[PDB]
Design a protein around this ligand. Structure first.
Ligand SMILES: Nc1ncc(-c2ccc(CCO)cc2)nc1C(=O)Nc1cnccc1N1CCOCC1
Length: 297
């Protein structure tokens, strides 16, 4: 019943699990959850097991397994392995081209638009998913320099059976640095879903800014810094983020010289709309995916 796997190296650590590069008797990623984190494993398993989720910008799922150990039991998620690792690490090490920015930006928007969509590309109905923890460290870089979504531990399936009371606590979920102003404010319209899609678009805007900040088409490129790196501490709290994002209406800096390049100007105008204080003023991920396809000459 169990797959012939040999764990090689610890490559990552998420909030609920450890990620290993492994040999399948070829190279796969094994995400290992302890018994205590069973709910996170089940949440990811349920998303990855949905056949309607399958997309080139969503991490390929192989199987889930329960593995008895001497000390107890582990819960595994076996997926495709992307050697280039996460986008934050990638942008820290590399200065990207305009072409790289277009491929990474468009694949990110396509992946998010697919999660958010109530239909498959072929028109069949599907469950929308909201990621709820989008950030550069959660995005995998494929060998062809396109994006790939993973880490669905905090994700929510937008099921019609969802209660208004269940969505309350829950509470503020995610990484404080990437939380939308309405999440930081505890100002969400829990009465309507799609308000959750808008929070994912805000986080996507910060990621698009990170990609843009390391693109040689801007002219002079600075060393990589995460969004708000120069204003907040390493692991910021919701209060410190609220003071910046909400009270000071603070957003990562876009120097005027970046706008000299027509492509960079279009990307900047788009991401600026996507991080608007008002969730209703934000573009949809589908709109962003369309704007990136317009960048093709
Ligand atoms: N499918 C995968 N294939 C390859 C790699 C990978 C490849 C290389 C390196 C660099 C090592 O020197 C790290 C990781 N990770 C995953 C993966 O699913 N990771 C993953 C899942 N959930 C939460 C966080 C995750 N990580 C995102 C990537 O960065 C670490 C955390």
């Amino acid at each position: 019943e169990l797959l012939p796997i040999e764990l090689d190296t610890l490559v990552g650590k998420g909030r609920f699990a450890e990620v290993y590069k492994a040999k399948l008797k070829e190279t796969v990623a094994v995400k290992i959850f302890p018994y205590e984190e069973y709910a996170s494993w089940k949440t990811e398993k349920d998303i990855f097991s949905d056949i309607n989720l399958k997309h080139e910008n969503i991490l390929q799922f192989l199987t889930a397994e329960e593995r008895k150990t001497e000390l107890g039991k582990q819960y595994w998620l076996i997926t495709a392995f992307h050697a280039k690792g996460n986008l934050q690490e990638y942008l820290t090490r590399h200065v990207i081209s305009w072409e790289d920015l277009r491929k990474l930006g468009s694949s990110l928007a396509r992946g998010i638009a697919h999660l958010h969509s109530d239909h498959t590309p072929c028109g069949r109905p599907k469950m929308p998913i909201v990621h709820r923890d989008l950030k550069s460290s959660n995005i995998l870089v494929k060998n062809d320099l396109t994006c790939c979504l993973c880490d669905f531990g905090l994700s929510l399936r937008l099921d019609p059976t969802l209660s208004v009371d269940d969505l309350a606590n829950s509470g503020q979920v995610g990484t404080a640095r990437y939380m939308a102003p309405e999440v930081l404010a505890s100002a969400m319209n829990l009465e309507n879903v799609e308000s959750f899609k808008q929070t994912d678009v805000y986080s996507m805007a910060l990621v698009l800014w990170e990609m843009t900040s390391r693109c040689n088409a801007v002219g002079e490129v600075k060393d990589y810094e995460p969004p708000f790196g120069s204003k907040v501490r390493e692991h910021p709290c919701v209060a410190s983020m609220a003071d910046n994002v909400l009270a000071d209406a603070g957003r990562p800096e876009i120097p005027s010289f970046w706008l000299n390049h027509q492509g960079i100007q279009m990307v900047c105008e788009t991401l600026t709309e996507c991080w608007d204080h008002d969730p209703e003023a934000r573009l949809t991920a589908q709109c962003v995916a369309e704007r990136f396809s317009e960048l093709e000459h």
